[PDB]
Design a protein around this ligand. Sequence first.
Ligand SMILES: CNCc1ccc(Oc2ccccc2)cc1
Length: 188
Amino acid sequence: AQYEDGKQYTTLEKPVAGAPQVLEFFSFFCPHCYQFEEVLHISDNVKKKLPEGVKMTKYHVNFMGGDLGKDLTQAWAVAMALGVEDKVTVPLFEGVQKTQTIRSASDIRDVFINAGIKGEEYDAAWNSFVVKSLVAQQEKAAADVQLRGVPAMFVNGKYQLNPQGMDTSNMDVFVQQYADTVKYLSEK
Ligand SMILES: CNCc1ccc(Oc2ccccc2)cc1
């Protein structure tokens, strides 16, 4: 009983059938999500412990940042459709929270242009119904679990990570505890 329901994780009372195996939610407006991604590298370290054949999904949410918050969910959909998440995640986080130079949908587009996505390719994707379906999927998954806080991670539709029960004196130990818990939960 080294991992206890209620301590390092909680159990959903209404488990979600058909869910992705590892499902992470975030917002580019979310201060802890900035730490999680830019300083701790949570997603990457989880993936390096996950068993073979367990895939990881990451989705943006609407409920922070009003109008721009919703623009960012559609931009994340563009990032997923074009496969350029690894190129835009850092300048989007920094544009929103560090330099505070992202203030409109056009400013979001600038980050993609600077990362090398051609202007016509971004605009075609942005207006595509493939991207509209990806926005729909992101919203659906958040609604499925009554999501009200980010950062958040879910395993096999049944378990939600609880980082509040982890020591933060050392950032590397914390990340390792987090990844090892996702691994334990995926095996279960
Ligand atoms: C819902 N928030 C989750 C959470 C909990 C603790 C936490 O502590 C850290 C903050 C910054 C850097 C390292 C750890 C960060 C996020």
